[PDB]
Enzyme design. Structure first.
Site: not given
Ligand code: FAD
Ligand code: FAD
Lengths: 484, 487
Positions: B51, B56, B59, B197, B201, B460, B465
């Site tokens: 690995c 892993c 890769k 895979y 990959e 969100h 989500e």
């Molecule tokens: C810049 C920014 C980024 C944000 N990013 C995230 C985020 O990434 N993830 C997340 O989950 N939340 C985020 N939020 C917050 C999220 O948008 C709010 O929590 C969510 O919108 C709240 O919904 P609400 O039901 O309180 O009303 P709102 O969605 O605020 O809606 C209120 C609505 O009522 C209307 N309204 C207001 N006054 C009146 C009125 N007198 N008469 C009629 N209608 C009216 C408004 O015009 C508006 O349309 C973010 C907020 C901001 C400002």
């Molecule tokens: C290209 C590739 C990508 C992979 N990607 C992933 C991944 O993203 N995620 C994941 O979970 N797994 C991945 N695997 C598999 C993962 O590497 C193995 O499941 C894991 O290494 C197995 O561990 P192990 O303890 O069985 O032996 P290994 O980690 O293979 O180690 C065995 C060791 O024993 C030694 N050995 C063998 N024969 C002898 C001997 N006669 N005398 C002495 N030493 C010896 C070898 O030199 C080796 O170093 C990938 C494998 C390959 C080939």
């Protein structure tokens, strides 16, 4: 037997789900109300709410774009040769793509009504006259023309939130997240004010699309950005953001913003430093948008910050008046609001009372690189349980040894209740972490234990498999204090 | 009070895992035996195993390198302008870079032994004289200079697998994955022989670095690449490979291979077809590498295909000898061989009897685009439960409407037991699924039901989500018969 069974104010994330469900699932009459039909100024948000129009959707497409700057760069160590001095980001190119996408979503919402018996859209500023009267005004001004008067049984209040401004001289020389999605040309120098995720996200965007030589300053009042997230990750994110040329300025705050003759803004931070920027974006916070609803006329209660008060079932103090989404200030995320939306219908029209679970809610910060966190931070668990253990793991992916972005550490931190080993929080920094945290969240829903993680055979090679190889707590918190 | 407590033949994934745990955690006298301490010809695998040396790790670095082809290309849509005509892959760089990586890893391995009392490395071909004596020879040749004779209590054979060859004329003209990791220049035309895979990959790596006007054809005997995976995913993957330029020649097998004047290999397929390629990679199979261990001397039972026969605890018929990893032929993956080896150490040196679970083992295919799967494919569940439900979902991420790679559909399919809704298999095709499936394995392992999934709030906007949005089955199987609805 009132004109409407439901009148949803706000066709956002939560209000549209409620509306559609009630109409499509329970043959109810539903008037949904929003200020416009297509994204963009003057209201920015529109049918579909903040997420589709000026939120998650365009924000993610744009963060996707911002990423190529790093990949194109990193492609180098892998044998890809290209005329690298010729690389030039095109902001207009980008914005036009985004606009094409978001408008596509807007158009689909429009046909969604010509397919649902009972679902009706109504354009205008909704406000209440009484607990069964929902006025649709042509404007936000209380005595403005009244377009409609919808008589209804229940009223859902899902009006989202809205950007917060600071009370300074030159506040009007700054833009917010709303404008930023429509900038004509990408700023060369931009200032992101705020340590929230919206601000950290846009800095990362402005930094990938800046003219050669440009600068991106992130000014935040406090000591460390992203308050609310794991503090160990907060430090890590700060270091890698800075590693990508973003200037993290903690303890800074615009004091006075002014316009230079050339149109750029001159800023004077409280610290006494000044500097100029093409753009100054305000990402201070989002406040519940209730103010022009005249909740007073309905009796409905509000908090001091403007948040409509609701209980577990998002019911306000008035039995037929409900509130979901950001307006309620619980968890301001799209999925959360959509759940609150779906549950309100179960409860009132399906007589199967359900309340949305705001604990163990997954979320990601699409910063570059991003975060995907779920659950508690040691701090809250530590003040909640007898003893908590914290696991930590960090490593620089091999490929980053080869790509050059060796500052790109992957970091997984796990918080548990040490008494029974149940996972309270999971916090990851590094690529794919928003993708990974989604399935981490089902686990936590099912109350997985640390033994459940470490007992699963890993998929290799992956950052994710790191979650299954944490058997020892780095330290703990016993009865609230760090230990070991 | 015998020469060593454990002699491990093979310094691999399982091998080294057992070696260190037995020594570093039970203070045993452990000797680890491998053919070489550095990756490369002439043996390919070496300390670290397959690995780390030719699996892993290399890769994954070569597929990361190969993803750039698409990435660089899709950046156009998001407004990235650059001299497109200037883009050229440089295989030799990938290869230097890769080598540098593996070596660092090989380098660290030697220090592992230097700082572990009781752990010792021994270089050569370990062979069995008798159930307590391990001959560390000079070569594979039985008449090899016996470099040292190890006296031992327990023996752990963990020699891995090796590439399986065909016996056609000119088989000797083809390479396997061991050699391709060392190709000098990226082949311009390449034949990837195999449906697995490893073959899929490589076709992705070759296709990405190939000189332009070049071509990678992938020939497989079966009817659809990746025998063993969710039928829909295989089918969709096939489309996505074609869509990116790879020529999936199904029902094609090489009859013979000859060498052309110009050094290229000419191939005639069993179907009569013929073509020339610079490289022919056989990635048709891997076989348990147990032949030169003289398991006869110590009386070890071996199955037909060279697989060392072992029980749930890895013990052979010979009570003091255990076999783990690719050589036992259970689930040939690095994590498995590892879990297996940790388990042996307990069973044998901690009297805490453990058996690795080879079930609900998630794994991934690092194709382009990649897959992440865990669980039962419908067919199998269908034979084990009267009523199995199948929820499927597929979509093209919005970014790909803008990138241009519109053929890139994220696909998720879940097979549940329809009686209790227990999730039996979750299968994905799409970027990040290798990461997303790792936690689904934790779920499925904890016995998750489909409600557990859809009852989780979504992140969100993410691809994952989708898992939390599949509440309605798409079709069933009732007593082995697919039906559109339960009646
Ligand atoms: C810049 C920014 C980024 C944000 N990013 C995230 C985020 O990434 N993830 C997340 O989950 N939340 C985020 N939020 C917050 C999220 O948008 C709010 O929590 C969510 O919108 C709240 O919904 P609400 O039901 O309180 O009303 P709102 O969605 O605020 O809606 C209120 C609505 O009522 C209307 N309204 C207001 N006054 C009146 C009125 N007198 N008469 C009629 N209608 C009216 C408004 O015009 C508006 O349309 C973010 C907020 C901001 C400002
Ligand atoms: C290209 C590739 C990508 C992979 N990607 C992933 C991944 O993203 N995620 C994941 O979970 N797994 C991945 N695997 C598999 C993962 O590497 C193995 O499941 C894991 O290494 C197995 O561990 P192990 O303890 O069985 O032996 P290994 O980690 O293979 O180690 C065995 C060791 O024993 C030694 N050995 C063998 N024969 C002898 C001997 N006669 N005398 C002495 N030493 C010896 C070898 O030199 C080796 O170093 C990938 C494998 C390959 C080939």
């Amino acid at each position: 037997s009132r004109a409407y069974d439901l009148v949803v104010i706000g066709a956002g994330s939560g209000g549209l789900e409620a509306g559609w469900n009630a109409a499509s699932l329970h043959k109810k009459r539903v008037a949904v109300i929003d200020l416009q039909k297509h994204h963009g100024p003057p209201h920015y948000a529109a049918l579909g709410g903040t997420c589709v129009n000026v939120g998650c959707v365009p924000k993610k497409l744009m963060v996707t774009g911002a990423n190529y700057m790093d990949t194109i760069r990193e492609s180098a160590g892998f044998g890809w040769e290209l005329d690298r001095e010729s690389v030039r980001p095109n902001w207009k190119a980008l914005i036009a793509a985004k606009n094409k996408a978001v408008s596509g979503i807007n158009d689909s919402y429009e046909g969604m009504f010509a397919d649902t018996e009972g679902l009706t859209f109504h354009q205008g500023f909704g406000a209440l006259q009484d607990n069964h009267t929902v006025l649709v005004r042509e404007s936000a001004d209380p005595n403005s023309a009244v377009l409609e008067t919808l008589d209804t049984e229940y009223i859902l209040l899902a009006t989202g939130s809205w950007p917060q401004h600071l009370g300074i001289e030159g506040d009007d020389l700054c833009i917010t997240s709303n404008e930023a999605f429509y900038l004509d040309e990408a700023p060369k120098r931009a200032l992101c004010v705020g340590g929230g995720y919206i601000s950290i996200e846009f800095a990362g965007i402005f930094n990938a699309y800046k003219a050669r030589g440009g600068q991106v300053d992130l000014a935040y009042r406090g000591d460390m950005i992203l308050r609310g997230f794991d503090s160990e990750l907060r430090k890590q994110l700060t270091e890698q953001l800075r590693a990508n040329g973003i200037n993290v300025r903690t303890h800074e705050n615009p004091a006075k913003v002014t316009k230079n003759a050339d149109g750029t803004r001159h800023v004077v931070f409280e610290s006494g430093a000044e500097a100029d920027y093409d753009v100054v974006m305000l990402a201070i916070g989002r406040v519940p948008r209730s103010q022009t609803l005249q909740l007073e006329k309905a009796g409905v209660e509000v908090a001091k910050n403007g948040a409509i008060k609701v209980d577990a079932y998002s019911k306000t103090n008035v039995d037929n008046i409900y509130a979901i989404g950001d307006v309620t200030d619980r968890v301001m995320l799209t999925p959360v609001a959509i759940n609150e939306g779906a549950a309100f219908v179960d409860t009132v029209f399906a007589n199967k009372p359900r309340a949305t679970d705001h604990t163990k809610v997954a979320c990601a910060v699409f910063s570059i690189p991003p975060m995907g966190v779920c659950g508690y931070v040691e701090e809250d668990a530590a003040k909640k349980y007898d003893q908590v253990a914290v696991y930590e793991s960090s490593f620089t992916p091999l490929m980053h040894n080869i790509s050059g972005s060796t500052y790109k550490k992957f970091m997984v931190r796990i918080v548990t209740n040490h008494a029974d080993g149940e996972v309270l929080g999971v916090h990851m920094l590094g690529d794919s972490s928003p993708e990974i945290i989604q399935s981490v969240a089902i686990c936590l829903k099912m109350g997985a234990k640390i033994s459940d993680f470490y007992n699963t055979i890993g998929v290799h090679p992956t950052s994710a498999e790191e979650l299954c190889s944490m058997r020892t707590p780095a330290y703990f918190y016993e009865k609230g204090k760090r230990v070991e």
